[PDB]
Ligand binder design. Structure first.
Ligand SMILES: CNC(=O)c1cc(C(=O)N[C@H]2[C@@H]3COC[C@@H]32)cc2c1O[C@H](CF)[C@H]2c1ccccc1
Length: 113
């Protein structure tokens, strides 16, 4: 029950919230890796070097891959950054990213010290 454990429990709580029915209307594009081929996005992997999605964050959390809150937050923000890099700012998925990042940032800010 040390500080790192406690901070990663807060991260795990946020992760569960981002995956919850409450946010499903705007979270769903981030549930699984972007299927570039299926979506016809044949330039996706040329523009996005480091893909990230919530299923990958969940696997890394379950595998105890994250050693601290900062490492977890870096993956969640990489996921949003990839969305803002690849997509025109007027696309629905960017509006959805902004809304889910608002949920993330406000709760991440309530990290226990
Ligand atoms: C992280 N997800 C994505 O970046 C993403 C990109 C595109 C896309 O087609 N992006 C291309 C825009 C126009 O050309 C470059 C960018 C489409 C969708 C995406 O997530 C959903 C699939 F999970 C799918 C979606 C469908 C309808 C509404 C919202 C989201």
């Amino acid at each position: 029950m040390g500080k790192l454990s406690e901070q990663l429990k807060h991260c795990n709580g946020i992760l569960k919230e981002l995956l919850s029915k409450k946010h499903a209307a705007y979270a769903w594009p981030f549930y699984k890796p972007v299927d570039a081929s299926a979506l016809g996005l044949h330039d996706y992997h040329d523009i996005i070097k480091h893909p990230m999605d919530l299923s990958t964050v969940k696997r890394k959390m379950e595998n105890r891959d994250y050693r601290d809150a900062q490492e977890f937050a870096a993956d969640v923000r990489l996921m949003f950054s990839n969305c803002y890099k690849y997509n025109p700012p007027d696309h629905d998925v960017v509006a959805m990213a902004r809304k889910l990042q608002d949920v993330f940032e406000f709760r991440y800010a309530k990290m226990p010290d």
